[PDB]
Design an enzyme around this catalytic site. Structure first.
Site, PDB file in Angstrom:
ATOM      1  N   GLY A   1      -2.347 -22.092 -94.728  1.00 40.01           N
ATOM      2  CA  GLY A   1      -1.001 -22.002 -95.279  1.00 40.01           C
ATOM      3  C   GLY A   1      -0.601 -23.238 -96.059  1.00 40.01           C
ATOM      4  O   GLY A   1      -1.445 -24.097 -96.335  1.00 40.01           O
TER       5      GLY A   1
ATOM      6  N   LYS B   1      -3.942 -30.789 -91.972  1.00 44.12           N
ATOM      7  CA  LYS B   1      -2.960 -30.686 -93.047  1.00 44.12           C
ATOM      8  C   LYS B   1      -2.978 -31.897 -93.991  1.00 44.12           C
ATOM      9  O   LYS B   1      -2.903 -33.029 -93.545  1.00 44.12           O
ATOM     10  CB  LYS B   1      -1.531 -30.452 -92.537  1.00 44.12           C
ATOM     11  CG  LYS B   1      -0.992 -31.478 -91.604  1.00 44.12           C
ATOM     12  CD  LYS B   1       0.426 -31.076 -91.169  1.00 44.12           C
ATOM     13  CE  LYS B   1       0.944 -32.014 -90.117  1.00 44.12           C
ATOM     14  NZ  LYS B   1       2.415 -31.941 -90.024  1.00 44.12           N
TER      15      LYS B   1
ATOM     16  N   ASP C   1      14.384 -29.002 -85.445  1.00 45.90           N
ATOM     17  CA  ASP C   1      14.048 -27.814 -86.209  1.00 45.90           C
ATOM     18  C   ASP C   1      13.205 -26.858 -85.432  1.00 45.90           C
ATOM     19  O   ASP C   1      12.212 -26.327 -85.908  1.00 45.90           O
ATOM     20  CB  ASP C   1      13.388 -28.207 -87.517  1.00 45.90           C
ATOM     21  CG  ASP C   1      13.383 -27.156 -88.597  1.00 45.90           C
ATOM     22  OD1 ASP C   1      14.224 -26.230 -88.533  1.00 45.90           O
ATOM     23  OD2 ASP C   1      12.541 -27.274 -89.528  1.00 45.90           O
TER      24      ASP C   1
HETATM   25  C1  LIG Z   1       3.823 -26.900 -86.895  1.00 47.12           C
HETATM   26  C2  LIG Z   1       4.097 -25.808 -87.877  1.00 47.12           C
HETATM   27  S1  LIG Z   1       3.404 -26.186 -89.471  1.00 47.12           S
HETATM   28  O1  LIG Z   1       3.030 -27.571 -89.461  1.00 47.12           O
HETATM   29  O2  LIG Z   1       4.297 -25.692 -90.479  1.00 47.12           O
HETATM   30  N1  LIG Z   1       2.020 -25.367 -89.604  1.00 47.12           N
HETATM   31  C3  LIG Z   1       0.778 -26.092 -89.898  1.00 47.12           C
HETATM   32  C4  LIG Z   1      -0.131 -26.197 -88.700  1.00 47.12           C
HETATM   33  C5  LIG Z   1      -0.257 -27.392 -88.000  1.00 47.12           C
HETATM   34  C6  LIG Z   1      -1.091 -27.482 -86.901  1.00 47.12           C
HETATM   35  C7  LIG Z   1      -1.814 -26.354 -86.497  1.00 47.12           C
HETATM   36  N2  LIG Z   1      -2.686 -26.163 -85.480  1.00 47.12           N
HETATM   37  N3  LIG Z   1      -3.136 -24.879 -85.491  1.00 47.12           N
HETATM   38  C8  LIG Z   1      -2.527 -24.302 -86.521  1.00 47.12           C
HETATM   39  C9  LIG Z   1      -1.710 -25.167 -87.165  1.00 47.12           C
HETATM   40  C10 LIG Z   1      -0.859 -25.088 -88.279  1.00 47.12           C
END
Ligand SMILES: *CCS(=O)(=O)NCc1ccc2[nH]ncc2c1
Length: 330
Positions: A18, A37, A132
């Site tokens: 994403g 990320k 949030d």
């Molecule tokens: C914490 C929600 S976000 O950062 O918007 N989504 C991105 C992530 C971050 C860490 C993860 N671990 N497994 C899936 C993940 C998605």
């Protein structure tokens, strides 16, 4: 791929998740897939401030129900550092995705709520506010372990500076904002997070957001449409005349009973929901009281609900991000 996702040879075989951008990857040292990320924050001060705050928080916190940072990848020098990559445990889904497709049993709702509050107890014990909380910030795996993520809007609690005027603009996700945000609150007290948890609980019960406001004041319209008009005592707590007189201007609205809105819900779940979705933030249940509520009796165990060991210009902030991430360098 989509762009430069440059995570050394430690992390290989990237799949998109994403969107900066999030990928899964194989960790060749621990032999598991991980989430990564990319944060390219250095051209926008807003993204830089939220980056440093999140990194500092997540590196200090250690809790089962809070996502950790496993590794941070960046260039060896400030001059070469254009992006930072944050490596976290890979979780198969999140509560937003799960609620769009799956009915939750009462047992699943109870266990998810327990883990949210258990995580939140730790966050609040460190004098931090998440600010949030929402289904997409609750990560889940296939065995229903839950981890709170996204501390980009988190702040140290500051109740003495919580007051503000009527209709003060606010950053956090609209549907989970407590009524006081629109009236007189900067969201600097722990009660802001409890309201969001209440909204999440209601959403777990019916798979639909309870207060889906379409714009800023519509959010308060939605809340008052279910809670009904605030009492005189609750109104008298709102000293700000613009906010007070707005509320007095509205036609009388009756409470919608929770058991009519949620005819299939457990009665104990609805008693706890009522206490989290209290209009007056001073009367709203606190995280430790919520854990001790009869709905959670099968899980409540305060000896196994740990607390934190202690309370918690772009050019200098790129420097601070560099310094904060130094421990992960070879
Ligand atoms: C914490 C929600 S976000 O950062 O918007 N989504 C991105 C992530 C971050 C860490 C993860 N671990 N497994 C899936 C993940 C998605």
């Amino acid at each position: 791929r989509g762009q430069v996702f440059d995570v050394g040879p430690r992390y290989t075989n990237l799949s998109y998740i994403g969107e900066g951008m999030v990928c899964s990857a194989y960790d060749n040292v621990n032999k598991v897939r991980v989430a990564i990320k990319k944060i390219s924050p250095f051209e926008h001060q807003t993204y830089c401030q939220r980056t440093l705050r999140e990194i500092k928080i997540l590196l200090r916190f250690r809790h089962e129900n809070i996502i950790g940072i496993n590794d941070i990848i960046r260039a060896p020098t400030i001059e070469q550092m254009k992006d930072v990559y944050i490596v976290q445990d890979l979780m198969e889904t999140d509560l937003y995705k799960l609620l769009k497709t799956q009915h939750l049993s009462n047992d699943h709702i109870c266990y998810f709520l327990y883990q949210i509050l258990r995580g939140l107890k730790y966050i609040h014990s460190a004098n931090v506010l998440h600010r949030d909380l929402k289904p997409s910030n609750l990560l889940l795996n296939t065995t229903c372990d839950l981890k709170i993520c996204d501390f980009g809007l988190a702040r140290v609690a500051d109740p003495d500076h919580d007051h503000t005027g009527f209709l003060t603009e606010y950053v956090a996700t609209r549907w989970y904002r407590a009524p006081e945000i629109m009236l007189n609150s900067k969201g600097y007290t722990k009660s802001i997070d409890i309201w969001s948890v209440g909204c999440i609980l209601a959403e777990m019960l019916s798979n639909r957001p309870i207060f889906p406001g379409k714009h800023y004041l519509d959010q308060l319209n939605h809340i008052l449409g279910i809670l009904g008009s605030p009492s005189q005592e609750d109104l008298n707590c709102i000293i700000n005349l613009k906010a007070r007189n707005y509320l007095l201007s509205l036609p009388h609205k009756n409470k919608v009973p929770w058991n009519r809105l949620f005819p299939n819900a457990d009665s104990k779940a609805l008693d706890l929901l009522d206490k989290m979705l209290t209009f007056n933030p001073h009367k709203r249940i606190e995280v430790e009281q919520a854990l001790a509520h009869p709905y959670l009796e099968q899980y409540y165990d305060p000896s196994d609900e740990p607390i934190a060991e202690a309370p918690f210009p772009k050019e200098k902030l790129k420097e601070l991000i560099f310094e904060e991430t130094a421990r992960f360098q070879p």
